[model samples]
Target: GLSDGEWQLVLNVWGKVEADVAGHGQEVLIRLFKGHPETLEKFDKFKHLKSEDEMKASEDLKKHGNTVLTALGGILKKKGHHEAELTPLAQSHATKHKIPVKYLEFISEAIIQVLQSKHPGDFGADAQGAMSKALELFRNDMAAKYKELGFQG
Candidate 1:
């Protein structure tokens, strides 16, 4: 369980980027692709998108990025209560996309990177650790679900 102070930090940090959800989400995705180019292969539609500008300009990328931000907002609003809501996404990735659970960590890291870039001093070590713990919980749950089905890849 996160402490009250940590939870407050989460809310405060999220508030900083909530106004431009799509843009911030896009930035996260762009940073992910730039930092770990291999991740682009997971997205069939975005695999060919090489440049950051190309990703930012692509309507499909924007739409998917918005979905990411919306899902994250929902998760934050629930305060870790509705984690099971992600089961379908986990199942799909395990069954179809065959994305490794490690990629989830990559995305989480990308979010932290973007948050730090945007908020600088506001996104301090405590907030970073809080968010990392939360993401680790989600990653563990998703990985368990994925492995339960005995899917290869």
Candidate 2:
């Protein structure tokens, strides 16, 4: 369902940002992720950022962090195994009862939080905590959502 050109654009953006954050290449024009070719220049082009440059770099980093987290959230929402939570409960009910799983998917709030952070920083720490909370929350929600979706809890 994904278009080729669109996919390439997405890939390129992701690749450059990933590379820039990890630090790679010289004189790279990957401005979004700080992969600027100037980083690799023999001359000290970016040496004197004059506060303004620092602010700009900080802003770019924030954006990059946000983008990455959003991507992760999308993936989790699409493929996460909420059913895993309902399995034991469902199985027990199936053998001797009619208990239904919940209709809501247990959403791990921590997943969203950690994904939003900068890793090893304030945002990152919050992300981790939030992800844990989310996982705990997911169980109940999954029970609810599963039952609503035609599964027994």
Candidate 3:
């Protein structure tokens, strides 16, 4: 795991490179497509943008979860998941440590759900409760991880 300062450095570099290669304007569009598949279906008919089949494909991809198919590599991606080589980017050596990454990804998704719900004043009790539970679980999980890693306060 990167220290906060180190992560900020990485984020700065990553943000720049990400915008350079992918461009940043369509993030809201992509997130909307993810959260509103049915609306997209209706809009597709009116907008003449995508065929029904194309919309279906987008819906399927969103449902399937991005990491399930991500190719393992120095940088995590959301495409064809093959094993990663020992090529380091931020760190000097590649460490899969897949267990921690998986947990972190789970925690991230839970946070995303909470944040997304915040946008529309739709933070239903159930979603908020789930977020609290996820946070508790994350805290317990991380405590165990720290103990296992010999990290003491």
Which of the numbered candidates is closest to the native, going by highest TM-score? 1
How close is every model to the real structure, measured as TM-score? Answer: 0.88, 0.23, 0.27
Error of 3 at 84 (Å): 17
Q: How many clashes in each structure?
A: 0, 32, 3
Encode model 2's per-residue lDDT on 7-123: one tens digit a residue.
343333333335453222111112321432232232244444444356356444345445534443333343334355345444444444443332112112222322243233333
In model 2, what is the error at residue 31, expressed in angstroms?
A: 28
Q: Pick the candidate with the highest lDDT.
A: 1
lDDT of 1 by residue, 1-153 (tens): 666776677777888778788888888889888988889988888977768878878988877887897887767665667556777777788888878878888999999999889888888888889877777767777787777878532
For model 2, what is the alpha-carbon lDDT of residue 73? 36
Which portions of model 1 miss their true places by more than 4 Å? 151-153
Say which prediction, candidate 1 or candidate 2, comes out ahead on TM-score: 1
Candidate 3 local lDDT, 129-150, one digit each (tens): 4434433443444444444454
Residue runs of model 2 more than 4 Å from their true location after superposition: 1-118, 123-126
Task: Indicate the worst ten consecutive residues by lDDT in candidate 3.
Answer: 85-94
Better of 2 and 3 by lDDT: 2
Cα RMSD for predicted model 3 = 16.8
| TM-score: the better of candidates 1 and 3 | 1
